[model samples]
Structure formats: C-alpha cells, structure tokens
Target: KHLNVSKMNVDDEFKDTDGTFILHDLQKDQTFVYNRKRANQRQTPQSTFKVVNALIGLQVKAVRDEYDVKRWDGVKREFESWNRDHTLGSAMRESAIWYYQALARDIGEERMKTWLHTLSYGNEDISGGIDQFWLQSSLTISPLEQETFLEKLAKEELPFDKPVMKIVKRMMIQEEGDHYTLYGKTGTRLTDMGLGWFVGFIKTEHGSYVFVTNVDDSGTKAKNITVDILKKYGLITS
Candidate 1:
C-alpha cells in the first residue's frame, strides 16, 4: 500500500528551514506526506522518545506507577516548572528531562538495550549510554518510524503489557475538546543549527490519525506547525 503524497506548505517562519510531515489516517487507508526523503531521514528522538520511555519505565518497575514522584535534584534548570517534584504525567507535561533520565538510569543499561531491541525503536542503538543516548545522537528515529512506533503503541501491539500502554497513553494527553482530543510529545535539539520534532495522534468524531513533523526549527514550534496543518485538513473541529 503506497502512501499518497500531498502538497504541504510550511509557514513563513520555516522558509529557510528543511522539514517533513507524514500523516496517516488510522481507520482509513488515507495518507499524506511532505518531503518524503527527509521523512525517512534518521534524527534524534529527543523528548518525543518520552512516550516509549514512560512505558519502559513503568514496565520495568523503575517508576512504581504514573503517580510515583521523582523529586527535584536541587539543581536549578532553565524551566521553573521542572525545578519541582514531578510524577510521570507532570514530567511529560512539563517536559522535565531529568525525571526521565532518572528513569533510564534506574532501568539501567541492560534493560534499556533489551527494550529498545524488543520495540524495534529507531536504529535500536543505545550505544552511547543509557541516560543521554536519545539526546546525544546515539538513538535516532525517522519520521516514518515514529509513526509506526506510535501506531503500534496506540494499538498496544508492542510486547508490553496492556496496562503499561494505557498508562503511557494517558500521560500523553496534551489537550481535549468537545469533539477532538490531542495527544503529543515535542522534541528539539535547542540549537541554532538543530532540528525539532512533534509526534502524536489526534482522535476525532470522524477518525483518528498519527502524525509526525520534523523541522529545522524548535520542537515547540513544530507543534504549532502540526496544529496548523491539522486545521488545514479539518482535523481540528469546533
């Protein structure tokens, strides 16, 4: 089944930035892709990998549950919201890197390597180290791979237990509406020459879709562009 390529325009902010977006209708066979080549290029999962990390954290019992808290290290960070104790959901909402890194560190190197291989994530390479692999260019995933990973996770098709998937999905909730709900995670390099990523799915009355947007801007900005395209395609409803 070949995907249909569609014309997609980036906002004026991305005029000089290279980007790719791939969207697939889960209930239907419809698919739309922009910058097919770049969509297949491997890039850092950044914080987008948090979805899987949460699952692994819970599955491996590194985190007791979604309600389990990781306290602040007393080390100051740029974001004030991250300076406090956080549960799994709160950490994901606040994009607190330290909490998940703590999870990875607890999960340990052997368990992390095995889980990455089991999930078939990206290149399945956690070579650099457990704590900073995703951020340090050791673990990479393409836009297309992200879509597949999310699709499987959404369906609980991975080898993980059902409750584990449900808990991670619950933590992924970003916003809710009358007819639609959005779930996503944003990842960015946070560098002048770095890239950004927004990956998630939207559930609507009509159907559900998984989308991934990788851009030359920041991860937060990637979500803005994703929402715009979702509006353009009538995914966002009143």
Candidate 2:
C-alpha cells in the first residue's frame, strides 16, 4: 500500500534534543518537524495494530466491551495485565497483548488476513489470519499512513464502516496538559535481529494529530523514540 512521506527540516532539533522527534500540530494540521526516514518503506507496527483487533472483536461481537478480554490464558501462555484486570479502559492504557491476541484467535488467521489484506496496509506478505499476530507478521505502515488512518478514524470515516473509535479513543494515551486526547496502540517484537514499531495519534482540542517513528535496536528504543517526540512537542513531560 502507499503511505505519506512528509517531514520538517530540523537537523538541528536533535543536535542536543534527547529523542527521535516527530511532531505534528493538530491545530495547523501540518507536521512541524520530522527527523527520520519515510514512515512506511517496510516498518513493523508491533502492538499498535491491537486497535484493529479490538475493532474486529466489536464487529464480531466477540466481546461486548474492552473489559471482555480480561483474564485470558489461551494455550497456557499465561499473560496478564493490571489494565486487563481492572477495566477495558485500563487494558487500553496498558496495551495488553494477550487480550488482543485472544481476539485474534477467535477471528482466526484466515479472517484476520482477509481484513489486513482488505485494508491495504503494506504488502501482500502481511498476514495474521485469526491465530496469527499481525504485528509479528512483518506488516508495515508509513508514518503518513498512520496519521491518515487516525484522521479518517477521528472523522469516523474508515473504509470498513466499523465503529470502534470509542474503544480506540479509550486506548489512546493522553498528553499531560494538551487540549487533546491521544488514541494510540504500541507495537513491539523481540528478535535476535532487532525491534521495531509505529505508534502515535493525538485527538487534540483543535484537531487530531498522528505521529509515528521506529528503530531497529530494541523495544526500548522504539518506546523512547515515541515519548521523546511527544515530550519535545510539550505533549508530554518528563
């Protein structure tokens, strides 16, 4: 699939700055600074895709609400989270993987693959039929594509016509004092090779802004990269 590739010229932003910064102003509806490669170009999106899984659950009635996935232990993998133990809202905050993985199992890899293919994420190789994990499937998304989808979602205009923005909204991590709510999913995969992901989206008071970045080092790098960008924009504080 095609993704957007726009950026800001700020070679100086990171000279003394602390993270891989990519900031987009919802008010202006434009990217102020972006110091990285194109968001697409084959970058893994890790657990960020969980929102998609949650959407599937809602569409299939697999679970009534976000809390439905609480206390899951499929295949005796033994996974848990404070958020899942509390409420769907908390699970969203936690970005609990097992909860979403269970939903994928129910949907089946074939069905899931159909959905992923239908969405035109990256390449045909991206597959996660119910049982498969889309994040680990080598699927990719451009930074611009990430924000575009978020924009479409905030506007309630996804091609699927599926309505789960409420859950999506619930999952977003909010910036401290920003006049917006961020709806985002975190993605990660550990491999001897490296780690990568695409995570960001803020529904600010003025409008919604989607931001994303990735790294080939470790999950920590990806996490720090995102937080750093948010912090740089004053979206989040230390």
Candidate 3:
C-alpha cells in the first residue's frame, strides 16, 4: 500500500492509453497492479484467447502437433503473412487470424465449448461463433482472470495433458537471453475503441512471473508498457 510513489511515476506511462497492468510473481506470490478497476473489468479476449485455443486445438487432435502446418486458402487476408501456409509456431508468432480461425473451425463448436467449461475460461462463453467468438464478441475475460489462468498454465497445473501444454507453451516464446526468457501472446481488435492484449509469463533464473496488459490502444504499445514495467522492476535488462 505504501508503494504509491513509484506507482505514481508508472501512471505516466499510460497517459494516452487506458490500460490495466497485472503482474504476479509465481515464486514469491507477490503482485503489482495498476488500474485495478479496469483489471477486473471484463472485455473481449481477442487474440489472447489463442493461449487457450492452442491447448484445445492440440488436446482434441484438431491439428497434429505444434509443427502441423495448416495450408492457407488462396483468399487474401489483412496481413500478407496469412496468405501462406503456417505451422502452429509460425501462425502464433505472427498472430495470424486466418490460421487460428481455421483451427477453430477444426476444433468445432461442441468440443470447444466443452473445453472452455472444463478449463473454466472467462465466463465460459463461446457464443460469439466458432471462428470469431473471441474477436470482440461474446467471449470476455478480465485481466485478473487472465493472470489466474495463466499462472496455472505456467505451472502446468491445468488439466490438459503435459505434452499438449508443453507444445503450446513452447510456441509462446517471444524472447530469450542468457538468464531470462519471455513467453507471451498478444491480441488486438481493430475497431473504433481499439482493444489490445498481451498475456503470458516471463521466466528468469531465480523466479517466474505471469502478467497481463490490456490497453485501449495497440497490442504493440501494450507490450511496450509491459517491458517498461519489467525493466523498472529489474526483471529485465533491455
């Protein structure tokens, strides 16, 4: 409660962006949050749902493994990258909507809904449509929920088989260095309101942490805010 002074400076980072930042230290059970009200507020999951989707996709055998390549249709999409075939790693790294939408189509409705219920994901609502449910539609998740779910996933405490979780977890590796590796997924929705999400965890030699950053701006910028916080906290050096 007495950490207000540093937190006061942290507020400046979110000046133009309406943001919620939640960080939980997996080892120490410590937490730092900004905008708790917004952190608890429910919002569409956007691409952050991919963390769950990949697990579900692999669990159900929708795609073979993380290396399984789903061929892209000739249809031109927003990102030129989506026009080509992609393995789970490539698709996730690029946040390609078409690839995961196709994966969602493969996972099917009943199975997806069942998995969501099993995992207790976000209110368990996939009513927005199979391939598009998490895209600013029915499915919504709070930052707190995202962090809670991720902590379990980070520890492999969720019900999914270890290999399934392992593959998806490996796919989330965004950056790595000598002593620390950052794993995460970013979700963005293109609308008048501009919703962005970056959810995942970072592992260091001594400890690990799970974090969620939701912003009323772009996902890239949300990630910038996250990194800045990490650096300020001395968890990352760059």
| TM-scores for every predicted model | 0.92, 0.72, 0.93
Superposed on all Cα atoms, model 3 deviates from the true structure by an RMSD in Å of 2.8
Query: What stretches of model 2 exceed 4 Å from their correct place?
Result: 1-38, 74-91, 124-129, 159-163, 174-178, 234-238
- List candidate 3 segments past 4 Å from native: 1-9
Q: How well is each residue in 4-45 modelled by candidate 3, as lDDT tens digits?
A: 223434687798889999888787677778899999999898
Tell me the tens digit of each residue's lDDT in model 1 across 1-238.
2223244454453567688888888876566777789989988888898898899888878887788897898989978999999998898888898999898899888988888888879898888688888884699988999988988876678988889888888888888889788889998885453789889988888888889999988887788888887777677765
* Per-model tally of clashing residue pairs: 0, 15, 0
Is candidate 1 or 2 superior in TM-score? Answer: 1
Best model number under TM-score: 3
lDDT of each: 0.83, 0.56, 0.85
TM-score of 3: 0.93
lDDT of 3 at 160: 85
> What digit string (tens of lDDT, one per residue) describes model 2 on residues 208-230?
56666555555456565666555
| Residue ranges of candidate 1 with Cα displaced over 4 Å | 1-16, 191-193
Against the true structure, whose lDDT is highest?
Answer: 3
Better model by TM-score, 1 or 3?
3
